[PDB]
């Protein structure tokens, strides 16, 4: 039941152009609280446990 | 759904089986046909 389907080879060009507006953007991350290193902006980690309280491990 | 496949040892077998084919003119025919002709195996062989 294919009422509507493309009608003209999409054009690489365009095609991609389409797929164009797309794009990523690296995690905004920051740097350790005292953990020293780069963490997920706002969180402890396999480097932390801190923040202000030792709520983790390592 | 009942397709048409439900095999029946008893059945299929019987129905078809070395013998029979044999017993027959026809059957026999093709059979030794197949045989050479092709190689392979055969019904009942199945």
């Amino acid at each position: 039941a294919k009422h509507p389907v493309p009608k003209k080879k999409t054009s690489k060009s365009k095609r991609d152009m389409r797929r164009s507006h797309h794009a990523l953007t690296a995690p905004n991350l920051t740097e350790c609280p005292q953990c020293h290193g780069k963490k997920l902006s706002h969180h402890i980690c396999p480097n932390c446990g801190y923040y202000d309280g030792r709520q983790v491990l390592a | 759904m009942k397709r048409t496949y439900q095999p029946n040892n008893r059945k299929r077998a019987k129905t078809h089986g070395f013998r029979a084919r044999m017993k027959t003119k026809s059957g026999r025919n093709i059979l030794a046909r197949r045989r050479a002709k092709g190689r392979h195996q055969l019904t009942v062989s199945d």
Binding site: K39, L40, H42, H43, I44, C45, Q55 | -
Partner: protein, 105 residues
């Protein structure tokens, strides 16, 4: 509906037991207030109070355990007996920014 609850339920449950679990953003954000709320009841502390709290949780051990046990360790404050903390990672395939929450202590 019956599910919203259920949750709050077992989560409220499990938690009190440990006092800080690991569910995603929201999930936690709520299990808080509620669970939270519940607390405030362990605080009220009595026939009633208990007859509620349990009403949901369903289970002496705890139910009591908290009402008596913890309750106190809180008798003073003003709600918030929980500190919902987001987390660094995310469950796979998914990619859900889970998070952890505890009874502010």
């Amino acid at each position: 509906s019956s599910h919203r609850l259920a949750l709050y339920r077992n989560q409220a449950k499990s938690l009190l037991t440990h006092g800080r679990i690991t569910t995603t953003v929201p999930k936690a954000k709520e299990l808080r207030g509620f669970v939270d709320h519940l607390i405030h009841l362990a605080k009220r502390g009595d026939l009633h109070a208990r007859r509620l709290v349990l009403r949901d949780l369903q289970d002496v051990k705890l139910v009591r355990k908290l009402f008596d046990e913890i309750a106190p360790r809180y008798r003073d404050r003003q709600g918030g007996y929980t500190r919902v903390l987001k987390l660094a990672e995310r469950r796979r395939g998914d990619g859900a920014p889970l998070a952890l929450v505890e009874l502010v202590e």
